[PDB]
Structures are given as C-alpha cells and as structure tokens.
C-alpha cells in the first residue's frame, strides 16, 4: 500500500488516463499494492497530504507548461514529469521546457522527463510503467487490524487518515462535497465544521468567490517567484483581524478607517499601499509582521526580495529600493539625500525606524540613558540609568535583522500585567530594549544562595504572582514557552509588597529539566508551573518521562499540605485532567492554603472525642472511644508515632495535664481518674473514684467536673500520692445536670453546668450563678433548654449549648444576655450549623467548630464573620490551642476517619492580608492596562 | 407560627392553627419540622393533634434529623411510639449515616416497629 499521487492540473488523469494507467479519487492499483490518489482542477488549499507523477499538456503552447511551480514546492512543504498525448515538433516544444525545468534546482529533483503517445495505445506507457516500478521500490499487527476495520505505521502509508472514520477515502470524498458546494447526518455536522475550519474553509468559503497620490502613500512590494498553493487562501483568513472590506481572491484591501488605506494585493508581486499617517504606519507594521511570521513559521521563500518605494519629486513614478540598503541608510542617519543636493525614512519604510511604536515608548536619548561600562553587564544585557532610575538594557549587536526586535516588542507592547515584565524605551540607534531592573534578580539565584529569606508567606506570594501572570498570558492566547526559576524575577523580599515576582522570557520547547512530558498546549504550561511550584516548595533541592517523589520524603522540608496536592494535580502524566491555570490561580488564592500547616489521618475506624497537647518536642494524647473501654493513644507531630494502649475500665472522657517543675490525668466514664507517667510511663496509679462519670478536667489547680455537677478540686501535689482526696468538693447542681465546661479568664474560673453558669475565685466557692434557660424568649426552647458544653470569656461569656447553633453572649457584670450568634445565619451564605466546639484566641477572633465540619470563625470585636473555612472532614469535635515549637490551633474532626489539622494561629490575619493583596493586584492590573494603552 | 407554637404548647395556639394554618408544611430558617420540633421539645398532645392533621412521621431537615432519629437521640420513651402509631412509621437516614438505634429502650421499640 505504498503511497502514490498523480499530480495533475486540469486533472488529465481523470479525463482519459485512469483506465490507461490501470474531486479526490482513491482506488487500489496492484502490481505490490499501490494506493493512487487523484487531484483536481478546482484546487485551493489541500497540500497537507503532500509517489508523484507530473502531468501537463504541450500542444497549447508554453504558458501551460510553465505552471507547476507551486506544485513542486508543495512536495517539500520522487517526482517524474510526463506530457500528454502530443499527437494533436513536440520534442522541439519540450526542448525549451526540458532545458528550463531540469536546469539548476529549487524545485525537487525530477526523476525522469518522459512523454506519452496518445490515449488509444502508447508504447511509451511500457517505458513509463517500468519508470514507476523501479523508483517505487527504491509492524504487522496494525496492518491486520487495519484490514479488519474496513471490512466492518499504516496511517502514514495512506491506510488511515491517529484516527478517522471508515476509509480515508471518505474524508477526501466529503471534502470534495465542500469543494463543490451527498446526504449526510446533521448530528455530526458540528464536528465536521471544526475539521473544515482547520483547513481554512470557515471564517469565509474561499472557493465560493471566483484617491491614491504619489507622496502620501507608502508602497511595499513583495516579489516572489510563485504564490504557493494555500498561501493566499490562508493570508486572506489571517488578515480578518482588528487593530486601531472588499477583496479579491488576489487582494484583500481592508480599508477600515477612510484615512488608513491598506491595499494589500497582488516573478509574482505583492503590493501594500498605505498612507503616511500614524495609523498607516502601524497598519503597515502589522501587515509586514504577519507576512514575515507566515514565511518564517511555515515555509521559507536570494529567495524573496523586499522592495521599498520612494520618490523625491512626484514627476518620477516610484523609484524603488531594496530594503537592506534602506536599512543601512536608516541605521546611519535618517534622511535620503537627493542625487542633486529631502524625504526621511519615516515616510519610506516606517517599520525600519520603528515609527509605529506607541508614543509612550521612545528611546529619548537626550543624555538620559547611560551604559556600556564593563561593570554594567547584567548575556548581552547591561545596567543603565533611564530617567534617573536604574534599568536593564539588552542590545542587538549581530544578526538582529530587525526581526528579533520587532517580534519581541510586538508582544511586549501588548502585555501590561503586574506580574508580566514591562517595556521601557525600545530604541534603534544602538538597537536596544530597555527593561525594568529586577532589584533582587532572578529567582534561581535567590533559591540557591539566599534560602534564609524564604518565609512560607513569601513562597506562596511568588507562586501566586507567577500563576497570576501565566493565567493572563493564557488569557491573551499566548503560550509562554519556557517557565523556570531562572525566568522568574523578584523585585522585593517584603512579603506584603504588591509586586514580588514577574515572569520574563529570556530567549537565547523548553529546557531539558522543566518541560512537560509530551515535549504542548496551555497544559504543558501548567505542568511547567507545577515543576516551578515543586521547586519553590523544595527550595531548589532538585535544582542542584518524569517521576517526582514527595518533597518531604527526601529534602525534609516543612510539610505544606494542599500544596503537595496542587503539585500532584498539576504535575500529571497526561494533559487531559490536569488543572487549567485559570483555576490554578484560584486554588493558590486561599488562606486555607496559606495557613493549614499540617493535617494527619488517624488509623481507620478510631473515634476520639478528647485530646490534650504536650507542654514540651511535640506530642499529643487522645482519648479513644471506638471501643467502650478505656483507650488512650499517643501521637507525635514531627514523626508519626501513633501508639494506642488499653488503660482504664471504661471509655476516657477528657484528659488534662499537670506539670511538676509530669502527670497526665485521664478521666473515665466509670468515674475513676487515672494518672499516667508522662516521661517514664511506668509509675501509674488511680485516684478517688467519683460518684458519676467525669466530664471536664482543669482548664486553669486540677479542677474536676463530673456528670452530676459535683465539682472537685485536686492540688498539683495530691496526684503524686495514690488515691488522693480533694481539697474540697462543691456540689453545683442536681445529678441530672452534668458539669461540662470550666474556663480560665481577673483570676476567676468560669463554668457551665446543665443550664446555669457559675464562677469562683481562689476561695473555691461560687460567687455568681447565672441563670440561662429563661433566655428562651430569644431563639426557642429546643435550643435554649439544652445543656451547656463550652463557655469562653474575655469581655462576655460566649456559651455554646449541646446541639444548638445559637452561641450566646452573657455579660459578666449585668448578668443578662446581650448577644446571640445565629450560626446557621452565617452558614446560609455558603452542613449542620449546630456548634460542637468553640475556641477563642487572643482578642482577634473566636473559632466556632460547627458540627457540620465548618470552622466558622468570627472577629469578636465587631461580631463579623471572617471566614467559613471547610476542613473537608464531615464533622468537627474538639478545638484547642497548642504551642508546638510557633503558635498553632489544632482541630479534630470525623469523616469513619478522624482527621487532625494543625493550623497556623492567624487564619483571620492571613485572610485579611491576602484579600487586601488581591484587591491591590486587581486595581494595579486594571490601572496598568488602562494607562499603558 | 407552628414552630414557636410547638415550644410552649398552648392548646389554644394549636387549636387556632388547627382551623387555619400551614400545618406540617413549612420549614423555618433552620429547616426543622415543627411537628418533631414539638416532639423533642417534650410535648405529647401538641404532637398528636398536629399528627391528626398532618400525618407525617418522616421528614428531613438541614442536618438530616428525621423525627425518629432525634427522638431516639433525646431519649423520649413514649412520643416516639406516638409518632409510630399515627402517621404510620418508616425508618430513614441522616447525612452522617446514623440510624436511630445507635442514637438511642428506644432501640427495642425500633426492632418491634421494624
Ligand atoms: C523572542 C521573544 C523573546 C521574549 C519575549 N518576552 N515575552 C515576555 C512575556 C510574555 C513574559 C511578557 C517577555 C519577553 N521579553 C523579556 O523577558 N525580555 C528580557 C530580556 C533580557 C532581560 C530582561 C530583564 C529585565 N530585567 C531583568 N532583571 C534581571 Cl536581574 N535579569 C534580567 N534578565 C537577564 C537574566 O535573567 C533573565 C532576564 C532582566 C528581559 C517575546 C518574544
């Protein structure tokens, strides 16, 4: 099934030659199997597919013979030329043809210059036939599967058009339907136009269509030997853009502004006719840039020549000059001296002297820019002082050709973002670009040498800023090729600064250590961003296919959850579900990400409802309740060391610590209080059995609150002796009302039992007993008449009841309800709402661990909700503050799985900081985009 | 309306609501069923009179508390059966995957009812 294509202009093949040889036609021609394709005479653009056999007539003359020039050049974007019948001399006619065609090169090498004699019968056909055979000859499992599917390495051999529907003939067959204008389903037409649009058919139907003055206009002439097939049909499509309409198949003069003529249209010639104004200069610049991008991106073609038109006086009609000579005349000087003793370049070829730059950017070299000292070197980038500020200049010494500079500033003048590096003073006289300095410089140089300054907030800011900039790039439909720590420039090391990092591409598919595995869409950029973020989090550990193990495992970096998740989510083996950078920014923009210092998962099906930390290197003790006996677990935060021991008869209800400048006091449902050695772990003993279960311990000296209100006092020295006795036991309420919460606050202990609050001093007798059920007038009975489980206080008692969203505010002096917080009302904005734990820190915020898994947290100064953080864990049980050793608040919840999340203590501060920061960035970006353009 | 009238439990309030109202047909800002609101606030006659006009025993709320769930949770021996006899009885499910047997004396009643 070797690929053979008959290349005819008028399709002389399908006229009379098919049966002799035996819309796009496909048929099999065995000898060896050959799959012949036929082309047609209504061709516009199909040369993507490009054996060969050139077919042409001679009898009409020589204009038709000199017509396959685009035909041969499409091959490189084995050829044999055959004439037609010739019976209706001929060799003499071909003699000029053969001499011209075979001479020199530029076209692909002709294998043979042959001719055929008539259609009825040809002896030269046999001579032709073996010429096809000799040059035609000079995995199996897919081939069998390929044969199977049509019944129901082959793809490049013509068997398959990858994946395609049925035979590849149909795609060319239905494409012929597009060429001419059978019955086809409407359900799949939406997909077909997408494939049709990929061949420039859509918008435009390319096959459907079939007051100038000398001084005021600039004429740009392109001579080229040929117009390649599809060149014009694509050029028409790409010049339907907009920038501050009648057309031919050869010529698309989009007038737009009546004063901004653009008569682009057709060795063959291409002419651009534009007026002498700023808009004409800019539009000429854009058209030249687009055409040069075409010819430098797909097909080269000394090759073409560039013309520039000028006229000193209008009597002479457009004396023309090559562009190179004029480029030298513009590099040195600016005018055109007349033959007799004039006109500047800016009126002849504006794009040479960058006359179409926005007026906000000109190298106003008036003793302002200073450079070229050896100390100013920053690769061919120097340090300069532009406008009394220090900047970085990059000069174009060699082979600039004014293509690197133009293609650099036509993208740099159209990107104004706080995280995208900005352009100042694009200049010609030394041909340089002047760039804002990176005061602290490239990121990589900081990661390798200045690891001291990498605060967690600064790392998150760098990643946030790069993600912001790269999101904007992807929004502008620009693929940012190569994203590394080398190309991230840090200006400041001050975490709350608005501008900390920008992205800047230093030109010199991606470096061999930072590219996506496929190296190519935005998704390769996202993989590159994931590598960047891994580099930031690791702080250059890997810097000094792909399988990247966990950063914590090797480098010992501080674990930063919900960023290892983002690294793993971006850095995927396939681009299909890795996140878009429209949402990578959204993920990185979250104080939960900033401050969630740690998260730990306990062994499966373990229920813990009470927990204590260690006061000095970090440890936690949990009271497990999955089995209805005593179960106490030891957890280690730095090195996971969960070890569970079976101690005491019944489930442990609450723990507390007593220190010996130690002892852990576990309170069990049977009522016994059991003391364990904290360090040695051998010396262990119980204490006085209590009448009912114990509920709360300490929060102060060894206060003990049972389930009948019978609150006892235990001194720090008493626990040293087995079976201790209370200094005093005071009864606070009946047996049916358990005493649940005791709190430290100005040295008075507060508490709540049943539905009554109380407080007591070092005398250890209650000095106030606040009555709370009567508050049922506010809220209602099902909530107000429940127990009280937690109280906190700094200026008023913040009491939480059992299974009640309302958290109540009780003034200490007036002894009267003055506030109530409808937790469900806060939760309506963004799933239980009943409070289950409640913890107050300093005077900034109180955190409310609602039963639905939401740590809904308030600024207690103004009774304002700051954030409604969601743990992802279904419910939350306990919230308490630990010193660690950095202040954290550590939270425990149920999913059954129990999750312990250690949070950096200042979520509210970080929420305000990031929100203000994002507002600053947003207004800065809007103002930058408004003012720059 | 019925939510507040189902806390103190006046005969007159529920009787006036009996003539006209939105019985077993409302959700407050919290989403509680006023019927089983009245049930766990700790009444009998309010619950039964609101049963003879509503006849609902299974209705969820924001947290998934069907009446049987938190009736078993609150340890009410008789009102759970009162909702069992009238309005019929069907078991249900909350959002955490908890059955009234675990929340609950009531468990034995659950086995014979189910
Ligand atoms: C063909 C093409 C190429 C690029 C883009 N291109 N695309 C973009 C965006 C899409 C990101 C907007 C930006 C750009 N151009 C640039 O980035 N130029 C640029 C060149 C040389 C130096 C700087 C620079 C400014 N200040 C600095 N300070 C320090 Cl310390 N070092 C610096 N350099 C030296 C060492 O480190 C890297 C950089 C610098 C800036 C387009 C086309």
Author numbering:
A (entry chain A): 1334 to 1355, 1370 to 1378, 1388 to 1406, 1414 to 1440, 1446 to 1456, 1461 to 1510, 1528 to 1541, 1575 to 1583, ...
B (entry chain B): 52 to 155, 162 to 171
Question: Please, what does the article write about this entry?
Answer:
Increased kinase activity of leucine-rich repeat kinase 2 (LRRK2) is associated with Parkinson’s disease (PD). Here, to our knowledge, we present the first type II kinase inhibitors that target LRRK2. We designed these inhibitors with a combinatorial chemistry approach fusing selective LRRK2 type I and promiscuous type II inhibitors using iterative cycles of synthesis supported by structural biology and activity testing. Type II inhibitors stabilize the inactive/open kinase conformation, reaching into the far back pocket of the kinase active site and disrupting a critical salt-bridge by releasing the regulatory αC helix.
Next, a chlorine atom was installed at position 2 (R3) of the 7H-pyrrolo[2,3-d]pyrimidine hinge binder to produce hybrid compound RN277 (30). To address how the new type II inhibitor RN277 (30) binds to the kinase domain of LRRK2, we determined its structure by single particle cryo-EM, using purified recombinant LRRK2RCKW. The sample was prepared in the presence of guanosine diphosphate (GDP) as a ligand for the GTPase (ROC) domain, as we had done previously. We solved this structure bound to a LRRK2-specific designed ankyrin repeat protein (DARPin). This small protein binds specifically to the WD40 domain of LRRK2 and decreases the preferential orientation of un-ligated LRRK2 on cryo-EM grids, improving particle distribution of LRRK2RCKW. Our structure of LRRK2RCKW bound to RN277 (30) revealed features of a type II inhibitor binding mode, including an open kinase conformation with the catalytic triad DYG motif “out” and a broken R-spine, and a disordered activation loop. However, we also identify some features that differ from our previously reported structure of LRRK2RCKW bound to the broad-spectrum type II inhibitor GZD-824 (21). First, the distance between K1906 and E1920 is 5.1 Å in the RN277 (30) structure, while it is 3.4 Å in the GZD-824 structure. Second, there was no well-defined density for the G-rich loop in the N-lobe of the kinase in the RN277 (30) structure, while this motif was well resolved in the GZD-824 map. Third, the Y2018 of the DYG triad showed different conformations in the two structures.
